[PDB]
Amino acid sequence: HFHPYNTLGLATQSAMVGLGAGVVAAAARNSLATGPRNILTTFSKSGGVVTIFTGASIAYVFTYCSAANLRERKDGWNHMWAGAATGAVLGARTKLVPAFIGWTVLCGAACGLFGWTGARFNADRKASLEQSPKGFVQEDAHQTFWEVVHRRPLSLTVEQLGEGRGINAVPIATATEAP
Amino acid sequence: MYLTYYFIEITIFLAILCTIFIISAKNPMVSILYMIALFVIAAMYLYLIGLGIFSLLYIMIYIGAIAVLFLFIITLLDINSTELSVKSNIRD
Ligand SMILES: CCCCCCCCCCC(CCCCCCCCCC)(CO[C@H]1O[C@@H](CO)[C@H](O[C@@H]2O[C@@H](CO)[C@H](O)[C@@H](O)[C@@H]2O)[C@@H](O)[C@@H]1O)CO[C@H]1O[C@@H](CO)[C@H](O[C@@H]2O[C@@H](CO)[C@H](O)[C@@H](O)[C@@H]2O)[C@@H](O)[C@H]1O
Numbered sequence: 001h002f003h004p005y006n007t008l009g010l011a012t013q014s015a016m017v018g019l020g021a022g023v024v025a026a027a028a029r030n031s032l033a034t035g036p037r038n039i040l041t042t043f044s045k046s047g048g049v050v051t052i053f054t055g056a057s058i059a060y061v062f063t064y065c066s067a068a069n070l071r072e073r074k075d076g077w078n079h080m081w082a083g084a085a086t087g088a089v090l091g092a093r094t095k096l097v098p099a100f101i102g103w104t105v106l107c108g109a110a111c112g113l114f115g116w117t118g119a120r121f122n123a124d125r126k127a128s129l130e131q132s133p134k135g136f137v138q139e140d141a142h143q144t145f146w147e148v149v150h151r152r153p154l155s156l157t158v159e160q161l162g163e164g165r166g167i168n169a170v171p172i173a174t175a176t177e178a179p
Numbered sequence: 180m181y182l183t184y185y186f187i188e189i190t191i192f193l194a195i196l197c198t199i200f201i202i203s204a205k206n207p208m209v210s211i212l213y214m215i216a217l218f219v220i221a222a223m224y225l226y227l228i229g230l231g232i233f234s235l236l237y238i239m240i241y242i243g244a245i246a247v248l249f250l251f252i253i254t255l256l257d258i259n260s261t262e263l264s265v266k267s268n269i270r271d
Pocket of ligand 1: 074075076077115116117118119127128132143144145146
């Protein structure tokens with residue numbers, strides 16, 4: 001099925017990556033600026049960037065691995081919870097509560113929309129029209145995704161929809177027959 | 180006879196040194212003078228590898244025309260230039 005994540009290992013890897021990103025961004029901020037600056041103001045007039053790159057990188061993947069472990073599956077919801085944690089880190093820079101709540105809701109919704117589609121900026125090679133079976137089916141095959149048939153099996157639609165509303169395992173007229 | 184062995188790694192070290200003297204110089208002519216030094220270290224490497232013809236083409240057009248072109252421009256033009264000070268370049 002799946003495999004649980006090392007929360008501490010992935011978190012400390014991302015902590016090192018966030019450290020390196022903070023260092024290269026502070027090095028970029030020194031040189032792309034004006035006025036009197038030297039070697040020591042790398043972390044003095046840094047704008048607080050290394051805290052951003054560190055805290056987001058820890059909180060996202062820690063919340064992601066923790067949510068994927070306690071739910072015991074992998075889908076787009078884990079990216080929602082992890083993006084909510086990232087919005088909590090990015091919302092605390094502006095020390096105001098309704099700002100903070102808005103960052104947590106909206107960045108979490110944007111990261112959940114990213115995670116639900118496949119959590120990829122690129123495409124999946126397989127499982128898309130050019131590289132997947134499409135069109136009609138040829139015989140009594142299990143209708144996969146991307147495919148069309150003319151009549152679904154009733155035992156499949158009763159499993160999917162339910163046994164309630166109007167849908168029944170026998171159509172209503174031959175259920176009421178004279179013998 | 181194995182004094183005559185390290186000849187390539189020598190010119191590699193000399194090219195490192197020569198670009199350090201390109202980008203750290205006072206006058207704008209001192210930089211192009213180390214640049215024609217860099218072209219001739221290159222042409223020595225190109226003879227060294229087994230290409231005697233190219234080295235002389237590099238002398239003909241790279242310490243040939245475009246050298247004279249740059250020396251010429253730096254003569255008949257004024258160009259302000261600061262020095263490599265620590266207070267303006269340690270931030271990089
Ligand atoms: C109009 C606005 C609405 C926005 C909707 C966008 C979201 C749409 C996403 C749904 C969809 C794209 C389909 C899109 C087509 C139309 C798109 C329309 C407009 C697009 C804007 C992406 O499906 C993604 O869903 C994610 C979560 O649900 C998963 O997250 C990730 O999970 C972890 C790894 O799995 C990651 O480790 C984790 O990191 C991620 O979290 C991804 O695995 C998954 O690829 C589904 O595609 C796929 O569906 C499956 C069946 O499921 C099909 O395979 C089937 O297998 C059998 C099963 O019967 C049958 O043989 C048969 O049935 C079929 O062979 C595929 O062929 C394939 O095609």
